[PDB]
Amino acid sequence: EEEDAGLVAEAEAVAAGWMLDFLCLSLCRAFRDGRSEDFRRTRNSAEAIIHGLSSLTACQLRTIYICQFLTRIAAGKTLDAQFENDERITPLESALMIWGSIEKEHDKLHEEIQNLIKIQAIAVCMENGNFKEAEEVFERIFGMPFKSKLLMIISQKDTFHSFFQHFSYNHMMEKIKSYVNYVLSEKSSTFLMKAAAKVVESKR
Amino acid sequence: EEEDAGLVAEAEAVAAGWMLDFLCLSLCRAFRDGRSEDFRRTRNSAEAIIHGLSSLTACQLRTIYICQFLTRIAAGKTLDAQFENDERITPLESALMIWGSIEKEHDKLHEEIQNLIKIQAIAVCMENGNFKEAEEVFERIFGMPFKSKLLMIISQKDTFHSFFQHFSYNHMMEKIKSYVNYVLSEKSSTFLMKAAAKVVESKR
Ligand SMILES: CN(C)C(=O)COc1cccc(F)c1
Ligand SMILES: CN(C)C(=O)COc1cccc(F)c1
Ligand SMILES: [Ca+2]
Ligand SMILES: [Ca+2]
């Protein structure tokens, strides 16, 4: 009885791992495609499946961080959303923290996404008229020429600035979508998606 | 692009179907074993996966009803839980409604579980001192000798009665566990559990 129970629990852990990779792939595709409601529903499923996983491999931790990063980016303009125990941390700041924790290459794209998130973390506060919060986010992030231009913009209390039109929220989203395309390619061959794709192809 | 999108959506539907069967099996096992926290976490995952499924086969509807039935039975003593749009319906009444909707054989076990749920739907109200609610549940359920004994018990306003000790909440749970054992046997061979069990066995 106990031997059977143990084998069943190990099989549930294997299946949970396969579901996590499949849900990450689906969440990435919904983000890339701009399918907002599919992203919301897939995120709910990913969160629930994660709470049923205990021990994680390095690969599983990376997959969970990708899901959490895209969720924060999707909520980047939702300044009322609290992703950290410290209630002061804004969604784009929480995304920046995960971006710097992921075991991944720090290539030119990595640094461009990092810097776009830093700029937009301040811009979203400015656009809402949250000038004091924009200064507080600046202090937490920055923690020379890039930094000084941002402080000057914050000090001018201007809800819109041409610098934010050049390094825009849309530009940040497009660069992140380029990275998501790489994750989609990498995870397309995981077990559950491969098996489901083989079934759909067999019926055509 | 649209052809690829369509094939991807069909593969996601196949994978969702496999996840639903696996989560039903896991929910059944946690119920049978009395693993309350595993049941709670698995139920959260099942609910989320169900919201991402649109069209359902008759087999998938039956699987969803089994999950919903066990969730109501697990909440049978939680009189503050509202499972229906009509806020008056108690959890055991909602379980009885699903039990009568499932496409399944109406064998002797089916009728014994049905009658135990009817008795306990009144008993749980009585045990809480909700005498008027017990009479209202009685009217909705009943909807001759079994019925008349129940009305007599309700009219006596006795928080405990020997009739409820004979056809007890524990007796109802044990009969339902006998049925769950049949569902476990039937669903053990579904795709995801079979594949995960093969992986665990291969490593032994
Ligand atoms: C701090 N919290 C509650 C979160 O990170 C919720 O977001 C998540 C969590 C996991 C997967 C996912 F796709 C999204
Ligand atoms: C009326 N509501 C919200 C429900 O029935 C929730 O319960 C559920 C639903 C689906 C699967 C499950 F395992 C449990
Ligand atoms: Ca806020
Ligand atoms: Ca109530």
From Swiss-Prot, chains A, B:
Q: What is the effect of changing S155A?
A: Loss of phosphorylation; induction of mitotic entry and apoptosis and increased radiation hypersensitivity of ataxia-telangiectasia cells
Provide the protein's localization: Nucleus; Cytoplasm, Cytoskeleton, Spindle; Chromosome, Telomere
Q: Which positions bear Phosphoserine?
A: S155
> Outcome of W18P?
Abolishes telomere binding
Description of post-translational modifications: Phosphorylated preferentially on Ser-155 in an ATM-dependent manner in response to ionizing DNA damage. ADP-ribosylation by TNKS1 or TNKS2 diminishes its ability to bind to telomeric DNA.
Induction record: Expression is tightly regulated during the cell cycle; levels are low in G1 and S phase and increase during G2 phase and mitosis.
- Protein name stated in the entry: Telomeric repeat-binding factor 1
Q: What does this protein do?
A: Binds the telomeric double-stranded 5'-TTAGGG-3' repeat and negatively regulates telomere length. Involved in the regulation of the mitotic spindle. Component of the shelterin complex (telosome) that is involved in the regulation of telomere length and protection. Shelterin associates with arrays of double-stranded 5'-TTAGGG-3' repeats added by telomerase and protects chromosome ends; without its protective activity, telomeres are no longer hidden from the DNA damage surveillance and chromosome ends are inappropriately processed by DNA repair pathways.
Give the position of the cross-link Glycyl lysine isopeptide (Lys-Gly) (interchain with G-Cter in SUMO2).
Answer: K149
- Region feature TRFH mediates dimerization, mapped onto this chain: 1-204
Q: Mind telling me which residue stretches traverse the membrane in this protein? A: none
State which stretch of the full-length protein is shown. 60 to 268 of 439
Q: Which superkingdom, per the lineage?
A: Eukaryota
Provide the tissue specificity: Highly expressed and ubiquitous. Isoform Pin2 predominates.
State how changing A15D affects the protein, per the record: Abolishes dimerization and telomere binding
Q: What free text does the record give on domains?
A: The acidic N-terminal domain binds to the ankyrin repeats of TNKS1 and TNKS2. The C-terminal domain binds microtubules.
What's the subunit arrangement here?
A: Homodimer; can contain both isoforms. Found in a complex with POT1; TINF2 and TNKS1. Interacts with ATM, TINF2, TNKS1, TNKS2, PINX1, NEK2 and MAPRE1. Component of the shelterin complex (telosome) composed of TERF1, TERF2, TINF2, TERF2IP ACD and POT1. Interacts with RLIM (via N-terminus). Interacts with FBXO4. Interaction with TINF2 protects against interaction with FBXO4 and subsequent polyubiquitination and proteasomal degradation. Interacts with GNL3L; this interaction promotes homodimerization. Interacts with TIN2. Interacts with RTEL1.
Protein encoded by which gene: TERF1
